Write a protein that binds this ligand. Structure first.
Ligand code: CLA
Ligand code: CLA
Ligand code: CLA
Ligand code: CLA
Ligand code: CLA
Ligand code: CLA
Ligand code: CLA
Ligand code: CLA
Ligand SMILES: CCCCCCCCCCCCCCCC(=O)OC[C@H](COP(=O)(O)OC[C@@H](O)CO)OC(=O)CCCCCCCCCCCCCCC
Ligand SMILES: CCCCCCCCCCCCO[C@H]1O[C@H](CO)[C@@H](O[C@H]2O[C@H](CO)[C@@H](O)[C@H](O)[C@H]2O)[C@H](O)[C@H]1O
Ligand SMILES: CC1=C(C/C=C(\C)CCC[C@H](C)CCC[C@H](C)CCCC(C)C)C(=O)c2ccccc2C1=O
Lengths: 228, 208, 740, 84, 41
């Protein structure tokens, strides 16, 4: 209505969205946040506002962890804190056996994968029921840790005593400001992860190594000259 | 009001929690009808009892074989125990089938006609040979009077179901680790504690 | 305006409706009083228009049925890949494609049946297949059976996903009519996304994985020492060794120096001399061009961004002086009726299948396919039959639309109204053309028969006596042959060896030899034109007279599938549009049988055979030009001279073809019982049998009636087509497998 | 690397196509031609910061794609003739 | 569950229960006992 929105806005997008959501910028030309989609009742499909905003915040947080971790052992590897043996790239540490695989681990990569499957299956499955039944993981006995899974009105922001042990949303303005900060940084991290994956295929090196090569030669080490 | 198999889900209508070992896990809607439920509960109880006896026997002979006795492993046990035996096969098969026909036929007719075999027909036994519950007989199969107390009988029934399910889940695991390693279950257990990081289900060639 | 209108949870998911078998129609819900209820339940199971008049409900039902069909096709495709992975000899055939015969089916030894497990060579025994799956698996690099196993598992996963998608879109998230009516969006995504991205992805696969077949497999390298397909994708040196342009690395593509990719994007007009098929680099360059063409084609219509076109505007802007209005309500016709779209789609689909049949034998695209006469003849014949069945179906659905979804309010003076206005002139002219072609195309055969019988061989239509030469086709053949010298300078040679002069042969057997045309080719071509005109006459008459004829003026209200209109006016049996389709099916069978007969005999007598040092010897004695001019020549030198393999097939490996031959004959002979008799006779005979059962009190609770008038015609035409097609199938397979 | 032969009119094709898509005289989202002789005025959908000319992002994409098609085509074809 | 078991009593009970039973019985008889042209009397 008043704020200078992003390039590529739409009349109908401004008709169904304007300054209400945290990442509200009027950028939805494809029309996926339209309330006319899935006009019935019940479970339904996936393209709907309730699930799409939930998917955007979950993607933002996972991409922030990924972008911070895909360059951390390489940045510390170029520094003198981490040992050079464990300072490998993010695509040769077991994610893809063909690119490469780290050797000295405390277990086999498949064993670590099974442990990860059980652990993250518990986490993501408990995360799904709360979305299906709001605030239902605080009723069944789960090792006495039911006091930390109380949930909230929004599935994207559960809060509680664990996820929000350090209280920061004392005021709605500061809570909304911090929410906008999380949304913007998560979108930047998603683009950084996309850049990390695309740069890893053309250059075949780590993400921080591409920046060091681009800084030493701006024209000799750029995208246009990389596909040569 | 009771812990369910999926925290946050809702149990079915025909599973209130009054059954022995009820948790609300029934996605394929089996045992929805009263007669089908009456048959399925007895099928689970008989499977739990046979699984507990079989797993206990396998672990006993396997532990005895690891200790030093002349016991064969759980797999291929019938092959090397029949070559040096005077009891002929076929005759042993039909002897087992003949005795089991009598026992299982009396147990089946006890299910279709509840409290019917205890009528002085089989050698004059009236007090016993009549079940107390669905798949819980009494009179003769209860030497110790532990069923004459509902407060402890309910808890003991819960213990029986929860132990039988773990035993049959363990029996399925006996076949898998045997077919994956060609060793005894007690040999696989002792080998896992000797190296919990290197040896596991992912470092045995098979199942990858 | 183009959005995603979905209606979540419209139909529950239970088995309550599975209990009552007749529930889609309001007439079958009463239950089965007479045995005709069972046949009505099966014949009305897919007529969604009879279920309701809700276009949104009808559209949702057809959208879920499409997913069910895709799941069925994916399961069948996965089954073929799994059979080739486990019960075949693909690895043995890969090292000797010119001596081991394909096989991908093993039979279990129950009652006899060991004889069917024929010795196909390579230390394996099974049913010899003629599907060409081995040649297809050769064309896109596939060395071991692990890749076929992985393809079968991946296809089964995709089949389960398609079935889940069908259930989801009909019970959990059903779309709306406003979503289904976006024809501009559907055309944009089908042209740009589906076809264009499919060609681009297949071009990428041929550019990277089809590398062993084009450079290592044909060079004599053992399939085990060939590097895996991912090594060529990751390691650039291993691909640069084969093709030097790969050393450039996407630089000539983006710097517009495409001339550097001239080694793996060749334009060679011909066949590979080591395999017999087209060049893989040529097929790759072909797919790359097609992808660009379709990607630029998918940006024609306007959807949500202003730029583009409007199909309604393009149709309404085409008005001429000979057609009155023209294309007035064609958009309303094609966007509100499914039968109209189904008729157009089925017509183009069947014609496309026929095009595929011609181009596959003409320009063989798979390695070691031209030297496999069994798979060659099998693939041509199969694609021809599928195409003919689809065109008859198009003629059926056009009449269905004209009977049900034709409103005479939105069509006042358009092309449809003008066409229905001069239907008498159209049918009379097609009738005359049909009769003229029949006389001039069959009287020549009967004339040659009489001239040969009377002892006057110099008075017959043959090459030696009075001839008729197809000069137009001879000139087109010459034009295509000398065309790469003047009108195609970048092409290395002619697009096919059908009109050339250089015979290619792999493994001693001929691959693609030049084809000559004489008087017999002129006679058989006119035979084909005549049968095509009769089939189009029956179908077009049915469509144009399905609404209301001058004999029966109220034929529209009578329905589409009705027996007759009583014994009045001398008799009005089979006057319905459905009956015309039944008559048409018969003529399509009569046309395609002559088409496949002409193909088999012409190939066996003029192209296929074996080459030696002292010339090339064909399969037959090269008697196509001296024995096709007479009808007795066909019955004597084709059906009687051939089929001797099918006849003497007992006790051999192909013993099932003699059984299939005799069995097919019985089914065809069984069709005549349903096709000549009526219904009153069978109803009275069934009455006598009912008395016999009532005497013993075994009277069925559901009173046993005879089949319907249209059911008897349907049963008869189904049995007739099954018997004739299976007869030709057993004969073709046994002959070409035992000879070629 | 080198921008002096193919770069010279690739730049020319894209630029002329931008002139068409902006200074009017070309099918766009701000101006639609019904009979290819005249161009009707259609209200735009999105907002462009372009200075009262009502230029849109889709106009940039459409005209740039067409200009690229015409430009790429000209460059490959021109080499075949003998020029450049 | 009642609707599924009543659905299983229309066409499968006669075309896949009896057909599979009879076909399997005749096939297993001809498999364990080879080809029978007389009563072996
Ligand atoms: C997140 C920000 C970001 C930053 C700071 C950098 C920084 C750098 N990149 Mg990188 N890149 C990024 C994102 C980023 N990139 C993304 C998202 C992609 C995927 C398309 C790439 C793909 C890429 C490649 C393949 C290469 C680089 C290279 C480089 C280095 C040289 C600069 C150059 O060559 O031009 C940069 C080239 C680009 C493609 C950057 C443009 C990305 C912009 C910000 C967005 C593009 C739009 C995107 C395609 C679609 C998203 C929007 C959509 C809604 C329309 C440099 C240090 C080169 C290198 O490694 O140097 C040795 C190299 O060849 N980048
Ligand atoms: C389309 C089938 C067909 C055709 C084209 C021919 C053609 C021919 N037959 Mg024949 N024949 C046929 C079927 C056919 N036959 C059949 C089925 C039988 C078995 C019953 C025979 C048995 C037979 C015998 C026994 C003999 C022939 C003979 C002949 C030849 C001379 C016969 C004759 O009288 O000249 C033609 C006479 C005509 C009046 C032709 C009229 C031409 C019409 C008018 C077309 C020209 C005008 C046209 C409408 C253009 C329109 C103009 C516009 C302004 C309107 C001739 C080339 C004789 C022969 O010796 O062969 C060399 C002979 O002895 N035939
Ligand atoms: C080869 C073609 C053919 C065949 C097989 C038959 C067969 C039969 N006709 Mg018929 N008929 C024919 C042509 C044929 N007709 C023609 C062209 C006409 C002139 C229009 C007639 C006119 C006619 C009349 C007027 C009558 C018959 C009658 C009969 C039945 C006689 C009873 C009998 O003989 O025991 C059985 C003989 C058989 C050959 C049985 C065939 C079935 C076998 C066992 C195969 C079973 C299928 C197998 C199990 C696989 C099934 C699965 C499959 C669906 C996928 C019989 C089924 C009379 C009748 O109704 O009898 C009461 C009768 O009234 N026919
Ligand atoms: C996106 C992929 C992914 C994910 C979700 C995880 C997740 C996890 N990893 Mg893992 N890891 C990954 C990739 C991944 N890893 C890769 C590619 C490798 C190299 C093969 C490893 C190597 C690895 C090791 C060596 C260890 C983990 C461990 C763990 C667990 C952290 C310990 C903890 O529970 O909290 C604190 C956690 C569940 C630890 C673990 O197994 O938990 C006991 C552990 O020590 N990971
Ligand atoms: C570029 C996007 C795209 C693609 C690739 C397709 C592809 C397809 N469409 Mg579709 N369509 C699209 C956009 C697209 N469509 C849009 C935007 C609309 C709305 C106007 C429609 C409306 C539409 C209708 C009404 C129908 C189709 C149908 C079909 C199928 C035709 C089957 C066939 O002929 O052989 C080709 C077969 C294959 C290539 C096998 C591939 C199978 C995979 C699983 C397909 C996955 C593609 C899918 C579109 C991905 C997005 C969905 C995602 C949420 C999973 C085909 C797979 C027909 C259909 O439903 O068939 C089921 C049909 O009735 N489409
Ligand atoms: C349409 C299909 C297709 C595909 C899939 C490929 C693919 C490829 N081609 Mg290619 N090619 C094609 C068609 C295709 N081609 C055609 C039609 C031609 C002309 C005939 C060529 C001619 C050609 C040449 C001359 C060459 C290639 C080459 C290559 C390889 C590298 C190219 C590259 O680095 O680009 C860029 C790659 C990217 C930008 C990466 C994509 C971004 C990734 C996937 C994003 C994922 C990140 C995600 C957000 C996070 C990761 C997840 C993680 C956390 C788990 C590559 C495997 C080169 C080669 O031979 O390789 C050895 C090369 O020399 N091609
Ligand atoms: C061998 C059997 C046979 C024959 C000969 C015919 C013949 C004919 N059918 Mg037919 N049909 C048949 C079986 C047959 N059918 C069967 C089994 C079915 C069921 C599916 C049908 C269903 C069917 C339909 C639905 C239609 C036809 C039609 C036609 C006519 C099309 C005329 C034409 O274009 O070609 C040319 C005609 C001929 C070649 C007839 C042979 C004449 C020869 C050359 C003799 C020459 C004359 C001779 C010299 C003079 C004799 C002298 C004597 C008097 C002393 C044609 C006369 C169509 C029609 O009515 O025409 C528009 C029509 O729509 N048929
Ligand atoms: C319903 C009729 C029927 C009958 C009576 C039998 C009977 C038999 N089958 Mg069988 N089977 C049938 C149908 C039938 N089958 C069908 C339809 C299939 C396809 C799914 C199979 C597939 C099948 C296989 C794969 C095998 C048998 C085997 C056997 C034999 C041992 C099983 C046993 O001990 O059970 C009780 C015995 C009562 C007398 C047995 C005599 C097994 C065998 O071969 O024996 C070595 C064997 O492996 N059957
Ligand atoms: C090779 C194919 C068969 C060859 C012989 C075909 C002739 C038999 C049917 C003719 C019926 C005549 C009634 C016309 C009905 C009619 O007059 O329609 C009207 C049409 C002009 O209509 P309008 O201009 O008013 O139409 C404009 C709007 O309706 C646009 O939708 O005139 C023509 O069709 C000219 C073509 C005459 C016939 C050309 C044959 C078309 C076949 C394919 C092209 C062949 C070219 C030569 C290749 C060898
Ligand atoms: C859904 C997407 C794909 C998922 C993959 C699906 C399953 C893939 C594995 C199933 C194949 C079964 O594999 C089984 O048969 C193969 C048939 O040669 C054999 O595989 C063996 O021969 C192969 C032929 O080159 C070799 O590459 C293997 O190293 C060797 O193990 C083995 O006996 C066994 O590995
Ligand atoms: C024979 C005939 C009938 C009578 C058709 C009947 C009685 C249909 C017969 C259907 C049978 C009963 C289906 C099942 C077939 C066999 C029983 C399958 C054999 C399976 C065994 C293994 C048990 C018609 O009603 C009719 C109507 C119009 C034109 C022609 C005809 C016509 O020719």
């Amino acid at each position: 209505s008043k704020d200078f929105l992003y390039v590529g806005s739409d009349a109908a997008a401004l008709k169904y969205l304007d300054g209400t959501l945290p990442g509200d910028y009027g950028f939805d030309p494809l029309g996926l946040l339209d309330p006319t989609v899935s006009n019935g009742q019940g479970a339904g499909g996936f393209v709907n506002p309730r699930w799409l905003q939930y998917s955007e915040v979950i993607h933002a947080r996972w991409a922030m962890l990924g972008a911070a971790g895909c360059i951390a052992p390489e940045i510390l590897g170029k520094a003198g804190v981490i040992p050079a043996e464990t300072a490998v790239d993010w695509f040769r540490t077991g994610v893809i056996p063909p690119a490469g695989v780290y050797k000295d681990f405390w277990a086999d990569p498949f064993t670590l994968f099974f442990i990860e499957v059980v652990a993250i299956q518990f986490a993501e499955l408990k995360r799904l029921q709360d979305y299906k039944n709001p605030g239902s993981q605080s009723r069944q006995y789960f090792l006495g840790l039911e006091g930390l899974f109380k949930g909230s009105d929004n599935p994207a922001y559960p809060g509680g005593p664990f996820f929000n042990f350090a209280n920061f949303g004392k005021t709605e303005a500061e809570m909304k400001k911090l929410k906008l900060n999380e949304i913007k940084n998560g979108r930047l991290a998603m683009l950084a992860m996309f850049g990390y994956g695309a740069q890893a295929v053309i250059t075949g090196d780590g993400p921080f190594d591409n920046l060091l090569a681009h800084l030493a030669d701006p024209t000799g080490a750029n995208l246009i000259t990389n596909l040569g | 009001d009771r812990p369910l198999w999926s925290p946050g889900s809702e149990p079915p209508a025909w599973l209130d929690g009054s059954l022995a070992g009820d948790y609300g896990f029934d996605p394929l809607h089996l045992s929805e009808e009263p007669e089908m439920r009456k048959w399925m509960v007895q099928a689970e109880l008989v499977h739990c009892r046979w699984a507990m006896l079989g797993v206990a026997g396998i672990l006993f002979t396997s532990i005895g074989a690891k200790a030093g006795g002349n016991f064969p492993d759980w797999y291929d046990a019938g092959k090397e125990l029949q070559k040096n035996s005077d009891i002929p096969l076929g005759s042993l098969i039909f002897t087992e089938l003949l005795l089991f026909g009598w026992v299982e036929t009396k147990r089946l007719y006890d299910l279709r006609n509840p409290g019917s075999q205890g009528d002085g027909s089989f050698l004059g036994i009236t007090d016993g040979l009549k079940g107390k519950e669905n798949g819980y007989p009494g009179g003769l199969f209860d030497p110790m009077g532990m069923s004459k107390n509902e407060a402890s009988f309910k808890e003991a029934k819960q213990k029986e179901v929860k132990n039988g399910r773990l035993a049959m889940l363990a029996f399925v695991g006996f076949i898998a680790q045997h077919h994956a390693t060609h060793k005894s279950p007690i040999d696989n257990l002792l080998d896992h504690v000797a190296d919990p990081f290197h040896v596991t289900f992912a470092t045995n060639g098979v199942s990858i | 305006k183009v959005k995603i209108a979905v209606d979540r949870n419209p139909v529950e998911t239970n088995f309550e409706k599975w209990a009552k078998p007749g529930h889609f129609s309001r007439a079958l819900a009463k239950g089965p009083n007479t045995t005709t209820w069972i046949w009505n339940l099966h014949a009305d199971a897919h007529d969604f228009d009879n279920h309701t008049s809700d276009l949104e409900e009808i559209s949702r039902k057809v959208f879920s049925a499409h997913f069910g069909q895709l799941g069925i096709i994916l399961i069948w495709l996965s089954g073929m890949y799994f059979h080739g992975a486990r019960f075949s000899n693909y690895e043995g055939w890969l090292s000797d494609p010119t001596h081991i015969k394909p096989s991908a089916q093993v039979v279990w030894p129950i009652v006899g049946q060991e004889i069917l497990n024929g010795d196909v060579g390579g230390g394996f025994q099974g049913i010899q297949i003629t599907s060409g799956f081995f040649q297809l698996w050769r064309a896109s690099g596939i060395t071991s059976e692990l890749q076929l196993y992985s393809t079968a598992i991946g296809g089964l996963v995709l089949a389960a996903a398609c079935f889940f998608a069908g259930w989801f879109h009909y019970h959990k998230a059903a779309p709306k009519l406003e979503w289904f009516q976006n024809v501009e969006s559907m055309l944009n995504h089908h042209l740009a996304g589906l076809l264009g991205l499919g060609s681009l992805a297949w071009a990428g696969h041929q550019i990277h994985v089809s590398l062993p077949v084009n450079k290592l497999l044909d060079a004599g390298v053992d399939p085990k020492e060939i590097p895996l397909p991912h090594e060529f994708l990751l390691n650039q040196s291993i691909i640069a060794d084969l093709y030097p342009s790969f050393s450039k690395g996407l630089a000539p593509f983006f710097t517009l120096n495409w001339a550097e990719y001239s080694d793996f994007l060749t334009f060679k007009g011909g066949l590979n001399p080591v395999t017999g098929g087209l060049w893989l680099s040529d097929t790759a360059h072909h797919h790359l061009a097609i992808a660009v063409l379709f990607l630029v084609a998918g940006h024609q219509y306007r959807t949500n961004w202003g730029i583009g076109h409007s199909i309604k505007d393009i149709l309404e802007s085409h008005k001429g002086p000979f057609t009155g209005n023209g294309h007035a309500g064609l958009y309303e016709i094609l966007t509100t009726s499914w039968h109209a779209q189904l008729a157009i789609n089925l017509a183009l689909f069947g014609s496309l299948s026929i095009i595929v049949a011609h181009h596959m034998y003409a320009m063989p695209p798979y390695p070691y396919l031209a030297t496999d006469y069994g798979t060659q003849l099998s693939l041509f014949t199969h694609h021809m039959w599928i195409g003919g069945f689809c065109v008859v179906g198009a003629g059926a659905h056009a009449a269905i639309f004209m009977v049900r979804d034709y409103d005479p309010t939105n069509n006042y003076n358009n092309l449809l109204d003008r066409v229905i206005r001069h239907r008498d002139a159209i049918i009379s002219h097609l009738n005359w053309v049909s009769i003229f072609l029949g006389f001039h195309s069959f009287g020549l055969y009967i004339h040659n028969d009489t001239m040969s019988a009377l002892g006057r061989p110099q008075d017959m239509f043959s090459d030696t006596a009075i001839q008729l030469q197809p000069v137009f086709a001879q000139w087109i053949q010459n034009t295509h042959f000398t065309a790469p010298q003047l009108t195609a300078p970048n092409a290395l040679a002619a697009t096919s060896l059908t009109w050339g002069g250089d015979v290619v042969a792999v493994g001693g057997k001929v691959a693609m030899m030049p084809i000559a045309l004489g008087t017999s080719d002129f006679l058989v071509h006119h035979i084909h034109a005549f049968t095509i005109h009769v089939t189009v006459l029956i179908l077009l008459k049915g469509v144009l007279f399905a609404r209301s004829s001058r004999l029966i003026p109220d034929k529209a209200n009578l329905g589409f599938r009705f027996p007759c209109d009583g014994p009045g006016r001398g008799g009005t049996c089979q006057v319905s549009a459905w009956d015309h389709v039944f008559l048409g099916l018969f003529w399509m069978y009569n046309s395609l049988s002559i088409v496949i007969f002409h193909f088999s005999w012409k190939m066996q007598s003029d192209v296929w055979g074996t080459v030696t040092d002292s010339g090339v010897s064909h399969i037959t004695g090269g008697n196509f030009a001296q024995s096709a001019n007479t009808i007795n020549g066909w019955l004597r030198d084709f059906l009687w001279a051939q089929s001797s393999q099918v006849i003497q097939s007992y006790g051999s490996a192909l013993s099932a073809y003699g059984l299939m031959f005799l069995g097919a004959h019985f089914v065809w002979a069984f069709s005549l019982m349903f096709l000549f008799s009526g219904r009153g006779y069978w109803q009275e005979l069934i009455e006598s049998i009912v008395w016999a059962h009532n005497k013993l009190r075994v009277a069925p609770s559901i009173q046993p009636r005879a089949l319907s008038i249209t059911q008897g015609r349907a049963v008869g035409v189904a049995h007739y087509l099954l018997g004739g097609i299976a007869t030709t199938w057993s004969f073709f397979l046994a002959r070409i497998i035992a000879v070629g | 690397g080198q921008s002096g032969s193919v770069r010279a009119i690739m730049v020319s094709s894209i630029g002329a196509c931008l002139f068409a898509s902006r200074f009017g005289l070309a099918p766009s989202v701000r101006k639609n031609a019904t009979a290819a002789g005249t161009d009707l005025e259609k209200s735009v959908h999105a907002a462009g910061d372009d200075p009262g000319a009502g230029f849109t992002a889709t106009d940039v994409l459409a005209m740039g794609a067409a200009g690229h098609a015409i430009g790429v085509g000209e460059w490959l074809a021109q080499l075949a003739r003998g020029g450049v | 569950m009642k609707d599924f078991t009543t659905y299983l009593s229309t066409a499968p009970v006669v075309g896949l229960g009896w057909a599979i039973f009879t076909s399997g019985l005749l096939i297993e008889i001809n498999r364990f006992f080879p080809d029978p042209l007389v009563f072996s009397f």
